[PDB]
Design a protein around this nucleic acid. Structure first.
Ligand SMILES: [Mg+2]
Ligand SMILES: [Zn+2]
Lengths: 330, 113, 63, 104, 38, 176, 126, 59
RNA sequence: AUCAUUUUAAAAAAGCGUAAAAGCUUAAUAUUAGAUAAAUUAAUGUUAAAAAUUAAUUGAUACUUAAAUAAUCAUAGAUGAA
C-alpha cells in the first residue's frame, strides 16, 4: 500500500561471448596475459604501514690488548653520520688517553654491506664528485650513481679522508680501515650483524584463509550460488550496505570542522613526498626474445644478433586477404 | 669530555654542577684522575651530580649488548650463505579457482592461530 | 532553541497528579513561548506548534 | 515574464500591490533622509599605552583610534578591533551618527 | 617553444603544467602559444 | 565529495565479509577461473547495488591515489574473459601491407624493412586499409599499436598516412 | 582578432551513449520518488537529444505500471542484447557505465563484421 | 666494562593528524523544508548604498 | 538610441566568427542527482493575533576587493668545483 523495497525481482543479466567461443584456433596467451597491477598503490591507498624495525647500526668491541674494534653496517645509517664518528673513533677522541702527537693508534675499523647504502633524499642521483688530473681540460665529475653500483668503496674511503685532519698522520690511520660489500667480514673472533631479509606479510588484512571462519561474518552476497571454498561463515546480511549515504542514520557532512581536518590531511600527503626513498634504476636489456610485447625487425642485423629467422614468416607462403565474420556465436 | 661520557653525562653539565658544588678541584687533576686514578674519578663525579640534584641517563639508542644477541640482531660466529631472494609478498590475493583447496590448506593450517 | 526542548523534554517525563500544577504550566507556557523571529528562516513546517501540543497532550487529562 | 501572459491577463488587477507598496518606501526614505534614527550604538575598547605599538597590534588585528576634542577638552587615543571600525561605516548613517566608546 | 621568464596565457585554452622544477604552458589549439620558464 | 564508482562485470560474482570485531572489512571476487580479494580501511565506507554491479566509495582519508586505484581495479576485472580492441587505418598511394600469421609487413616509402611481429596478440585483417588488434591488456596494446603509427603518421597538411580509427587529428592548409 | 589556421578535429573520439539502441521502455510507479524522476530525465535524452547519434528505428516510450516492483529502464541493442535496470536505488551515473559496458563491446562485434560505426572527423572540433 | 657496545639505526615516526572526523545524525532525511523570509520586510530595510562609489563609476 | 515583447530565463549584446549572411561561447536559467547554510549579543513585567518583529557580529561555500609569507626559476665567461 506504500513504497516497500522489493526482495526478489532481479532479472537475468546478459552473458557475453567468451574469447574461446569467438576466436578459437589462435594464441591462448592473448586472453591470459592479464592487465598490469601496480602494488605500490595499494599499500598507500588501503593503508599498510610497515612496522618500524630498529636493527643495529654500529658497535664497539674491546680486547685484552689495547686494540679496539669499531664496526658499522652502512645499510642502516646514512653515509655522513657513519663517516663522522669514524673520524672521531679512528683518532681516539673518545679514548681519554688521546695525544694527537701519537705515532701509534690502537683503534681499528671495519665496515660491511657497502653495496646497499642509505642516502636520505634525492642525493644519490644529483650529487657528484669532482677532481682534476693535472692536464688542461680535465675537471672530471662523477656521479654517486657510478660509485653506489660499480665501486662504492672509494666513496666511503673518500669522505673519511675529508673529515680527518689534513696532516701526515692520516695515511697511518687509513691503513687501518677495511670495507666489505657482503654481509660478512673475514676476521675471526668478532661478531657479525644479522641481516634483515624478512618482509611483512600483510595477509591478515585482505584474506579470509588466514583467519578462522568462526570469527568472520558475511554481510552481503550477490548470487544464490554460494562458493564451497567459503563454508562455515554465518550470513547476517545488513540492511545497511545497500543504503546510499543519505538514507543511513549517520551521514558524513562537510562542515567547517571536517574541512578544517581535510586541509590537515592534505598537508600530510605533501609532507610525506619528502620522506620517500629513491632508487638507482638498473640498466636495461631489449632482447625481443624475452619480452611479452611486440616489436620490430626494422633491419637485418636485428635478426642475426637475436636469431629471429624463426618468427619471421618465409616469403614462400600465401597470404591472408580478408577475415570478416558475419555471425557471432552464442 | 670522553671519560665522563662513559658515565652518560657530557662535559658541560658536569662542571656546571662542579661550581655549584662545594668542591674546588681543577680540570688538571680530573684529567690525571680519569687516566691514572679512575676509581676516585667516579667518586668525585657522584657528589657533583648529587649536590646539583642532577640525574644521568644513557642515550636512548643504546642496547645492553647481551639483549642485542637475544633479539637476533647479531651473532658472534660466521654467517650463512643467503637464500635466493623470495618474491615480494603481494598486497593483494590472487589465484585460480582450480587450486583453492590446495591453497586453503597452506594458509589455514600454518597460521590457523 | 536547543535548551527549551530540554525543558519540555523533561516535562514530558514527569507526570502531573494535581490541578494547580497544570494551571501553573499553561499560564507560564503562554507568555514564555519561543518566538518565530528568533527561529531560523529554514526549518520544519509549523515546528512551533509541535512544541505546544507535547504539553497540551500531556495536560489534557488533568485539566 | 515569470508567469505566462494568458494567466497574467486574469491577474492584471493584482499588480496594485506592486505600485501601492513603492509609494511607501520611497516616500518614507525621501522624508527620512533628514532625521537621525533614535538608536544607541556602543563600541567596547581599551586605553592606549606606550607599550602597544602599531605593528604589534596589527598582527593581533586591532587598530589605533584618535580623537581631536574641542574647546578646553583633552584629546583621547584608544585601541580597538578592525571589524568594529568597518561595521561603523556599514551603517547608512556613518557621516554623522553618534558612536560611543566604552572603555570601562 | 620560447623561453619567457614571465609566462603568459594568450588564449583561454592555454594551461600550465609542472614536471618537477620544470614549468611551461601548452595550448590545445595554437601550438605556438607554448612556452618555458628559464 | 567525489564518490568514486567501482564497476563489476556480469560474469563476476562477489561477496563481502567482516569480523565479529568489525575492525576488518574485505571483499571477495570469484569467477569460474579466477578469484581475487581486497580490503577497505576503517575510514572507507561502501555502498553496493546488484541493480548495476557498481560499488560506491567515500574516503575520510582524502587520498587522491584512489582515482588510479579504480582504473586498475576496473580494467583488471574486465581483463577476465574479455578483450580490449583497437583499429588502424591508412590513406595513400604507394602504401600497402601484407599479413601472415600475426606478422604484418609494411611498405610505406622506406628503404629499410618494417616488419611488425606480435607476441601474444591477435591481428585480423578486414580490408587493405584496415586492421584490428586484440589483447587482454590495454597497456601492451598501445605499445603494440603505436609502433605501427610511428612509421608514418598523419601529415598536418593532408590526412595521408596512418592513424588510429578514433583520435584527435590535426589539419593545416597548404597550396590553396 | 586573429584567425585560427590549425584545425583540431574531435569527431572520431565522440562516443555518445544511446547510439546503439533500437528501442526503450520507461516504467513508472507513482509510489517511487527517487525512481520516477531518474526515468523522467532519461526519456528526454532519448528524444530531446539529437537523431544523428541515434539509430533510425529508435522509438522510446513511457508507461505507468503500478504493478511493477520498481520503476524500470528496459532497453534493446542492435546485435541482440537486452536488459532491464530498476531505478528505486540507483543514480544516472551508475547507469551510464553499464551502457558503456555494452557500447564498448558492440564495436568489438560490429567492427569484426566490417561495419564502420564511427563518425567523420569534421563533425565536432574543439 | 662498557666497550662491548651496540647502538641502533633511526626510527621515523610521522604522525597522522589528531583532529578526527565528526559524524552526524540524519535528521532532515524524510523532511521537506521551506523558507520563512518576508520579502516585504527585506525590501523596506534601508541598507547602506555606496553612493561615493556610485558617483565615480558614472563619468 | 538602449525601447519592448514571448519565455521558467535569455544583453538593440561582454567576445570569437562572415565579402555581407550563416554558424560558435559567455551573462541570465531550467529538469535530475549529489550537496554548503552553523554558532551568538542587546531590548518594553503579562497579553495583539485565522497574521506580522528591529539594530548587529563571527564562521562554511561561490562571485569580488585585493595584499602578505615560504619555496622554485629569472644565462654566463675564458689555466681547474672556485
Ligand atoms: Mg535582442
Ligand atoms: Zn593557446
Amino acid at each position: 500500500s506504500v513504497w516497500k523495497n522489493p526482495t526478489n525481482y532481479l532479472p537475468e543479466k546478459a552473458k557475453f561471448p567468451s574469447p574461446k567461443e569467438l576466436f578459437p584456433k589462435d594464441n591462448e596467451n592473448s586472453w591470459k596475459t592479464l592487465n598490469d597491477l601496480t602494488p605500490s598503490l595499494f599499500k598507500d591507498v588501503q593503508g599498510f604501514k610497515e612496522k618500524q624495525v630498529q636493527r643495529a647500526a654500529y658497535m664497539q668491541i674491546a680486547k685484552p690488548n689495547g686494540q679496539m674494534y669499531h664496526i658499522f653496517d652502512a645499510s642502516k645509517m646514512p653515509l655522513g653520520r657513519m663517516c663522522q664518528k669514524i673520524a672521531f673513533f679512528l683518532q681516539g677522541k673518545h679514548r681519554p688517553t688521546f695525544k694527537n702527537c701519537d705515532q701509534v693508534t690502537y683503534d681499528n675499523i671495519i665496515v660491511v654491506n657497502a653495496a646497499n647504502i642509505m642516502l636520505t633524499g634525492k642525493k644519490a642521483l644529483l650529487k657528484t664528485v669532482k677532481y682534476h688530473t693535472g692536464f688542461v681540460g680535465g675537471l672530471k665529475e662523477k656521479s654517486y650513481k657510478f660509485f653506489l653500483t660499480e665501486k662504492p668503496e672509494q666513496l666511503v674511503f673518500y669522505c673519511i679522508s675529508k673529515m680527518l685532519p689534513k696532516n701526515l698522520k692520516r695515511r697511518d690511520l687509513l691503513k687501518k680501515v677495511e670495507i666489505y660489500r657482503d654481509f660478512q667480514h673475514e676476521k675471526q673472533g668478532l661478531p657479525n650483524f644479522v641481516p634483515y631479509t624478512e618482509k611483512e606479510t600483510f595477509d591478515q588484512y585482505f584474506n579470509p584463509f588466514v583467519h578462522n571462519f568462526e570469527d568472520l561474518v558475511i554481510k552481503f552476497q550477490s548470487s544464490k550460488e554460494t562458493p564451497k571454498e567459503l563454508e562455515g561463515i554465518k550470513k547476517e546480511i545488513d540492511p545497511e550496505i545497500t543504503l546510499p549515504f543519505n538514507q543511513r542514520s549517520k551521514i558524513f557532512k562537510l562542515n567547517a570542522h571536517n574541512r578544517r581536518v581535510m586541509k590537515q590531511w592534505k598537508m600530510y600527503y605533501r609532507r610525506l613526498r619528502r620522506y620517500k626513498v629513491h632508487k638507482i634504476k638498473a640498466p636495461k636489456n631489449r632482447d625481443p626474445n624475452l619480452s611479452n610485447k611486440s616489436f620490430m625487425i626494422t633491419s637485418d642485423r636485428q635478426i642475426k644478433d637475436f636469431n629471429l629467422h624463426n618468427r619471421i614468416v618465409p616469403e614462400e607462403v600465401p597470404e591472408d586477404d580478408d577475415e570478416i565474420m558475419r555471425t557471432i556465436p552464442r | 669530555n670522553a671519560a665522563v661520557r662513559e658515565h652518560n653525562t657530557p662535559y658541560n653539565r658536569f662542571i656546571w654542577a662542579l661550581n655549584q658544588s662545594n668542591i674546588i678541584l681543577d680540570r688538571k687533576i680530573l684529567s690525571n684522575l680519569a687516566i691514572n686514578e679512575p676509581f676516585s674519578f667516579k667518586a668525585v663525579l657522584d657528589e657533583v651530580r648529587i649536590q646539583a640534584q642532577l640525574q644521568s641517563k644513557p642515550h636512548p639508542r643504546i642496547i645492553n649488548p647481551i639483549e642485542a644477541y637475544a633479539k637476533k640482531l647479531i651473532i658472534d660466529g660466521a654467517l650463512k650463505p643467503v637464500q635466493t631472494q623470495v618474491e615480494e609478498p603481494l598486497p593483494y590475493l590472487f589465484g585460480k579457482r582450480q587450486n583453492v583447496e590446495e591453497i586453503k590448506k597452506k594458509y589455514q593450517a600454518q597460521v590457523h592461530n | 532553541l536547543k535548551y527549551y526542548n530540554l525543558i519540555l523534554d523533561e516535562i514530558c517525563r514527569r507526570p502531573i497528579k494535581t490541578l494547580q500544577e497544570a494551571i501553573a504550566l499553561l499560564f507560564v507556557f503562554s507568555h514564555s513561548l519561543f518566538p518565530n523571529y528568533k527561529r531560523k528562516e529554514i526549518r520544519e513546517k509549523d515546528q512551533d506548534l509541535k512544541e505546544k501540543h507535547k504539553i497540551v497532550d500531556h495536560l489534557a487529562d488533568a485539566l | 515574464t515569470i508567469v505566462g501572459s494568458q494567466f497574467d491577463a486574469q491577474t492584471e488587477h493584482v499588480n496594485k500591490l506592486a505600485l501601492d507598496l513603492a509609494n511607501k518606501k520611497y516616500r518614507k526614505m525621501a522624508l527620512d533622509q533628514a532625521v537621525l534614527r533614535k538608536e544607541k550604538v556602543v563600541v567596547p575598547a581599551e586605553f592606549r599605552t606606550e607599550k602597544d605599538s602599531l605593528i604589534s597590534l596589527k598582527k593581533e588585528l586591532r587598530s589605533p583610534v584618535y580623537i581631536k576634542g574641542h574647546t578646553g577638552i583633552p584629546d583621547v587615543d584608544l585601541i580597538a578591533d578592525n571589524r568594529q571600525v568597518f561595521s561603523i561605516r556599514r551603517r547608512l548613517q556613518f557621516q554623522n551618527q553618534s558612536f560611543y566608546f566604552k572603555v570601562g | 617553444m620560447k623561453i619567457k621568464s614571465a609566462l603568459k596565457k594568450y588564449c583561454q585554452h592555454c594551461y600550465i603544467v609542472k614536471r618537477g622544477k620544470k614549468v611551461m604552458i601548452k595550448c590545445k589549439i595554437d601550438p605556438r602559444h607554448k612556452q618555458r620558464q628559464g | 565529495m567525489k564518490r568514486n564508482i567501482l564497476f563489476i562485470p556480469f560474469n563476476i560474482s562477489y561477496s563481502y565479509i567482516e569480523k565479529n570485531n568489525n575492525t576488518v572489512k574485505f571483499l571477495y571476487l570469484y569467477n569460474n577461473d579466477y578469484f581475487f580479494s581486497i580490503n577497505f580501511n576503517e575510514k572507507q565506507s561502501i555502498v553496493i547495488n546488484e541493480d548495476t554491479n557498481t560499488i560506491v566509495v567515500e574516503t575520510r582519508n582524502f587520498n587522491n591515489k584512489i582515482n588510479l586505484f579504480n582504473n586498475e581495479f576496473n580494467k583488471f576485472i574486465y581483463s577476465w574473459d574479455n578483450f580490449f580492441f583497437n583499429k588502424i587505418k591508412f590513406t595513400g598511394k604507394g602504401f600497402k601491407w601484407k599479413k601472415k600469421e600475426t606478422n604484418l609487413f609494411l611498405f610505406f616509402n622506406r628503404a629499410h624493412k618494417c616488419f611488425f611481429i606480435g607476441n601474444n596478440i591477435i591481428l585480423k585483417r578486414l580490408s587493405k586499409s584496415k586492421v584490428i588488434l586484440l589483447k587482454n591488456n590495454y597497456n601492451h596494446l598501445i605499445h603494440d599499436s603505436i609502433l605501427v603509427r610511428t612509421i608514418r603518421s598523419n601529415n598536418i597538411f593532408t590526412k595521408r598516412g596512418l592513424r588510429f580509427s578514433r583520435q584527435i587529428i590535426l589539419k593545416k592548409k597548404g597550396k590553396t | 582578432g586573429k584567425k585560427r589556421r590549425v584545425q583540431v578535429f574531435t569527431g572520431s573520439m565522440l562516443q555518445p551513449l544511446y547510439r546503439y539502441l533500437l528501442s526503450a521502455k520507461i516504467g513508472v510507479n507513482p509510489l517511487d520518488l527517487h525512481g520516477q524522476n531518474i526515468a523522467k530525465q532519461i526519456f528526454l535524452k532519448c528524444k530531446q537529444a539529437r537523431p544523428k547519434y541515434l539509430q533510425n528505428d529508435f522509438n522510446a516510450t513511457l508507461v505507468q505500471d503500478n504493478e511493477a516492483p520498481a520503476s524500470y529502464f528496459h532497453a534493446k541493442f542492435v546485435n541482440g542484447y537486452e536488459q532491464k535496470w530498476y531505478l528505486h536505488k540507483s543514480t544516472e551515473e551508475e547507469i551510464n557505465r553499464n551502457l558503456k559496458y555494452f557500447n564498448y563491446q558492440i564495436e568489438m562485434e560490429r567492427n569484426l563484421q566490417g561495419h564502420d560505426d564511427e563518425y567523420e572527423d569534421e563533425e565536432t572540433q574543439l | 666494562s662498557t666497550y662491548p657496545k651496540v647502538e641502533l639505526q633511526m626510527v621515523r615516526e610521522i604522525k597522522e593528524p589528531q583532529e578526527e572526523i565528526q559524524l552526524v545524525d540524519n535528521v532532515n532525511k524524510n523532511v521537506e523544508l521551506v523558507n520563512y523570509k518576508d520579502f516585504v520586510h527585506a525590501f523596506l530595510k534601508d541598507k547602506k548604498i555606496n553612493e561615493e562609489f556610485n558617483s565615480q563609476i558614472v563619468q
